[PDB]
Ligand binder design. Structure first.
Ligand SMILES: CCCCCCCCCCCCCCCCCC(=O)OC[C@H](COP(=O)([O-])OCC(O)COP(=O)([O-])OC[C@@H](COC(=O)CCCCCCCCCCCCCCCCC)OC(=O)CCCCCCCCCCCCCCCCC)OC(=O)CCCCCCCCCCCCCCCCC
Ligand SMILES: COCCOCCOCCOc1ccc(C(C)(C)CC(C)(C)C)cc1
Ligand SMILES: COCCOCCOCCOc1ccc(C(C)(C)CC(C)(C)C)cc1
Ligand SMILES: COCCOCCOCCOc1ccc(C(C)(C)CC(C)(C)C)cc1
Ligand SMILES: COCCOCCOCCOc1ccc(C(C)(C)CC(C)(C)C)cc1
Ligand SMILES: COCCOCCOCCOc1ccc(C(C)(C)CC(C)(C)C)cc1
Lengths: 114, 110, 117, 56, 81, 55, 81, 81, 81, 81, 81, 81, 81, 81, 81
């Protein structure tokens, strides 16, 4: 009942967005690159892409990593494994009798339950 | 040393793809195409034919040849033609029978 | 001083407004530009202004206070023309003290350049 | 014009691999040693193909 | 194929409601027109005499569309079987 | 009692948010992969290896 | 072709709900009229007396459309079988 | 042609929900009136007394249509079979 | 599978109300245009003559879609069996 | 003509989703009243006390229609078979 | 299980009603687009010359959407059985 | 007359979809309230705290109506046989 | 009397679309919050930090109902046979 | 229980109008983007060049959702039997 | 009692139209964000850089709900028989 509290500056919000912009500026500072060896495929209009000019920053951070740059790529061969096996499976020849007796994940199969 | 140079050479290659393409276009239109250019283009077409075969192998999914081709698979179209002919032949008879039955029931009751 | 007037047209930040007898009571900024006054005799009189505030009473009494008021007749496009590129050079010259001055001089010259033409 | 028609027709073909190309170019500019990049620029000023030189 | 013709007498009276659902939408246009005339006259009473025809115009056109919708619902019943 | 009600409501809300957003995102991913597997001209890292992942 | 007359007695009452759904749309304009007349009278009290007939007129015309929809709903039942 | 008469009894309770859907559509135009009264009182509090007769009038008669929409669905059930 | 062609004569009439509900949707844009012209006139009386050509234009083209929406439902009945 | 009575038990529930669809459309009218109260207080702070009596009245009676719209859906199920 | 293929010829027309209900929606964006040019010209007559391309561009696309919906409705009947 | 009772088990779900379509309409009233709070605070920062109770009161009994609709749609399935 | 139980399997996938129509109706309210935050910061940039909580607060709530509307249609298919 | 599979060929064409109805809703957003850009330019002519990029962005991309709303109806007929 | 299961294959598509119809409602919320950014920069050009992130964020969120609605329509057809 009527405590008469003065304003506390610690409860204000005048540093969160500046700090976030400081972090983002620290991020974008590592995107600075030299002119030598520079190449970027622009769009057909000649205008730049979106993701294109922000690959150097990501790979400059990958440069500074220690373990992820030597581990996180080992899941990438698995993508080509799928690319190959999918194409093998798009046209795989199978037995008609076995397909009619044991269709995979087909509906109204009483052996499954429904 | 080679890994560093192999990486560093990628920008040069991607930059000179368009450059070499434009000169090739200019040389074909202008007609100023010489023996060395012809040899390089023939080497290019050989490698392209090889990678075309390789892409066929990758896209088929089989290393030997296509699948679901052959007279065993082509005959199913003629089998379907005959099956549809038989099915329509029987369906016309059944529909005529049912229509006669319905016309009987209607002209008897209605 | 309290002259009978049929209608008056004003320039504002929101845009351009028209004022008639018994207009709704309103007060707002005047944007630095020109002003048009139409008397009951069908005539017209135009005045360059520098901002100010216009108060319109419901009874039909308009009080306008400005920092300057000069007719269009007392300004020439000739002398105005030279100041245009001066304002543009001030706007393009990167300097916080001069860029704003270029912008403001251009802000006042553009209605004048459009009104004389 | 016909150039604009060709542009808007070949946009979608031309733009499929542009991402990986820019990715590899930037990753090369980042991860490769700048001495190697300078040597590449040197050979390109000398009219040579630095990829063939490296393999050789 | 076999040809079965059906005549649904119930559909005589459904579409009347389906049209009746839309009869109320032009009323908002009506009130929008009158609201515009009111706020415009309050902004400039002198212009009221000039906007009165427009007001009468903008109502009637909106009102006419409602009438056409309403007419369909009444034409659906007392002539059709 | 409204404290219990609000707790249950926001717990169920968080569960639904996580589940439905994950499911929808995975579904869109699977449809895109089906389109690209059926059109191998597009079965390429068309946005980029790290760009899409970072985003 | 074959001919089946069907009489759907249940459709005597399905359309009434759609009409009733149409009865509530005009209220947006009903209130929009008074909502205009209020603001007008605030921005100019003196013109509050001269905009009064327009407010009554606008309300009545919006409400008449609502009434016609409602009239269909009552006529849909107590005469139809 | 043949005459098949059907009496759909469920439609008696379907149209209850159909008219029920339109019972809340007025409510926006019900609270719109008091919203306008608030904005007008904020504009000129001295006018607040002169406006509330033209508020309750626009309030109740916007509410009234909802009643006409609600009564139907309640008369639809306790008498009809 | 057996093939039964059916011709539903009731559907000749249902669509009429469904388009009739769509005849009122342009009626709000009608007053949106007339209100635009009114408020622009109160903004500047002197420009009233130069915006009138865009009033009758801005109505009639919006009214044109209201005509075609009304045209179908009237074409739906007196020619279709 | 032969009398085929049908009692559709599924129809007990379809209307409940329609009334439930109409329980939401009052909510915008409800929040409109408090939105008006907020902007009215930001227009006149000290007036916030004398407007709150005219704020709950628009709150309840807009909420009241939702209740009746909500009432039907609950009265449609727990008593009807 | 048994397999009855049916071809409903009445359903040739029901879709045309819904399409005709969707032909009137873009009229709102039409009037909003001409209205914006009106008000923007009232606020700045001198700029009216270079906003006309933007106005016709917006109206033409919005009208195209209406036209495409209408095209579906008219293609649904005069060719399909 | 002969009595054919039917129990349509598909009708367990249609109403659930309709109510689900109705669950979203309060969402615009929520952001209406919060947008009003924002513009009131930007108009007058010192009134930021006095309208915060109304910022919470506007959401609670607005989201509740969305929940009653949602409560029906989920009550429509997991209890009815 | 006679009793025919029927299990309509099409309503498994009809109600999915019927709920899917409503998933977007919150979005127009969702964007209202960020539009309000924009214009409020345009009136007072210094307050943009204190209103940003109410901006995030305004999104996740308004977005939530859309998600709840999306739940039923996804609850409708991947569990029911 | 017995199982009657049915193939409703009319549903090939019914849905065409159902999707078609939603093709005109985006038009209001599309025209809204220009109705914004006009007023913004009337507020600040000099900033017209920096808003034009974000004036065609939302223009074509709201039409893109309209395109996918239209692409279904065109994918509904000329491929399905 | 007797038990007739029915599998309506036509229902594979009737929902797809409704799901497609709901894709265009968020487009207004989509353009509402760019319109807000336009008017914000039109009142304060210097703040244009600090509000552009909010602008991009809002476009994606409004667009996502339309995009979420689209998933049902595409999921309704290419897998279900
Ligand atoms: C398709 C659409 C509809 C789909 C319908 C299905 C049927 C269609 C099937 C596909 C259609 C064929 C089109 C493909 C041909 C083509 O490229 O079109 C463009 C092509 C070029 O047109 P242009 O006007 O001269 O373009 C101007 C500039 O090139 C413009 O320059 P730019 O800046 O725009 O760049 C254009 C582009 C293309 O640039 C070109 O100009 C090349 C032109 C080639 C000539 C065309 C050959 C066609 C061969 C036919 C067989 O540049 C690139 O992207 C470079 C691509 C390089 C390959 C990517 C390598 C990725 C890395 C993979 C290896 C990684 C290894 C691991 C590394 C590990 C390290 C750690 O058009 C044609 O020649 C017409 C062909 C018919
Ligand atoms: C749009 O997003 C706005 C949300 O705002 C989040 C505010 O919180 C920001 C916290 O970010 C940090 C992180 C680390 C740090 C420091 C630099 C102090 C970390 C330290 C202790 C390692 C030096 C400071 C701020
Ligand atoms: C923890 O949160 C910090 C994460 O912040 C990530 C921000 O991501 C955006 C960074 O991506 C970019 C975008 C643009 C650019 C450069 C392309 C600014 C434009 C330039 C270099 C041409 C001026 C660089 C990186
Ligand atoms: C396996 O390799 C087989 C190579 O076959 C080469 C076939 O020869 C083609 C040569 O064609 C030309 C074309 C033009 C010319 C000109 C006239 C332009 C003269 C030149 C090349 C000396 C400038 C000469 C030869
Ligand atoms: C612009 O041209 C670029 C290259 O294109 C050359 C196209 O050549 C056509 C090749 O066609 C085929 C296809 C299949 C084969 C078979 C299957 C016989 C090859 C095999 C047995 C090695 C798999 C051979 C040639
Ligand atoms: C604390 O919570 C209060 C408990 O609530 C009790 C539930 O409501 C009472 C329901 O009890 C019934 C059940 C059936 C009936 C019948 C079937 C007799 C009613 C009828 C014939 C109208 C359908 C009447 C009342």
């Amino acid at each position: 009942a009527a405590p008469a509290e003065k304003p506390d500056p610690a409860l204000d919000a005048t540093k969160a967005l500046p700090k976030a912009l400081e972090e983002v500026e620290f991020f974008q500072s590592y995107a600075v690159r030299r002119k030598t060896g520079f190449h970027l495929f622009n769009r057909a209009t000649g205008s730049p892409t979106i993701v294109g000019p922000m690959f150097y920053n990501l790979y400059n951070f990958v440069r500074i990593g220690r373990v992820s740059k030597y581990v996180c790529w080992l899941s990438l061969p698995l993508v080509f494994q799928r690319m190959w096996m999918k194409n093998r499976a798009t046209g795989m020849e199978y037995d008609i009798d076995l397909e009619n007796y044991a269709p995979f994940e087909a509906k109204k199969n009483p052996m499954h339950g429904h | 040393e080679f890994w560093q140079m192999y990486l560093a050479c990628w920008p040069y290659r991607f930059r000179n793809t368009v450059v070499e393409w434009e000169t090739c276009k200019a040389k074909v239109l202008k007609g100023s195409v010489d023996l060395q250019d012809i040899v390089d283009l023939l080497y290019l077409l050989a490698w392209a034919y090889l990678f075309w075969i390789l892409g066929e192998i990758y896209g088929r999914g089989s290393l030997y040849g296509y699948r679901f081709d052959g007279e065993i698979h082509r005959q199913e179209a003629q089998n379907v033609i005959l099956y549809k002919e038989k099915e329509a032949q029987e369906m016309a008879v059944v529909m005529e029978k049912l229509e006669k039955e319905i016309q009987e029931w209607l002209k008897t009751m209605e | 001083k309290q002259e009978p007037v049929a209608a008056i047209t004003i320039r504002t930040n929101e845009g351009e407004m028209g004022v008639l007898a018994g207009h709704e009571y309103t007060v707002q900024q005047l944007a630095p530009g020109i002003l048009e006054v139409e008397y009951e005799g069908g005539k017209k009189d135009q005045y360059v202004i520098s901002g100010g505030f216009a108060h319109v009473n419901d009874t039909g009494v308009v009080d306008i206070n400005t920092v300057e008021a000069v007719p269009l007749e007392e300004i020439d496009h000739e002398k105005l023309a030279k100041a245009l590129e001066e304002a543009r050079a001030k706007s393009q010259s990167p300097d916080e003290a001069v860029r704003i001055q270029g912008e403001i001089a251009l802000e006042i010259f553009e209605p004048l350049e459009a009104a004389l033409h | 014009s016909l150039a604009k028609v060709w542009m808007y027709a070949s946009w979608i073909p031309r733009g499929i691999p542009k991402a990986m190309a820019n990715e590899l170019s930037s990753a090369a500019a980042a991860l490769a040693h700048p001495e190697a990049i300078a040597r590449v620029a040197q050979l390109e000023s000398q009219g040579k193909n630095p990829y063939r030189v490296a393999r050789a | 194929a076999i040809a079965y013709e059906v005549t649904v007498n119930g559909a005589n009276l459904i579409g009347a409601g389906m049209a009746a659902s839309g009869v109320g939408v032009p009323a908002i246009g009506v009130a929008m027109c009158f609201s515009s005339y009111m706020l415009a006259a309050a902004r400039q009473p002198n212009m009221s005499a000039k906007l009165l025809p427009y007001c009468i115009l903008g109502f009637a056109l909106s009102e006419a569309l409602a009438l056409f919708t309403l007419l369909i619902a009444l034409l659906e019943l007392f002539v059709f079987s | 009692m409204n404290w219990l009600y609000q707790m249950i409501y926001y717990g169920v809300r968080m569960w639904l948010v996580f589940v439905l957003h994950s499911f929808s995102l995975g579904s869109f991913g699977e449809l895109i992969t089906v389109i690209t597997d059926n059109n191998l001209i597009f079965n390429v890292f068309y946005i980029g290896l790290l760009g899409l992942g970072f985003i």
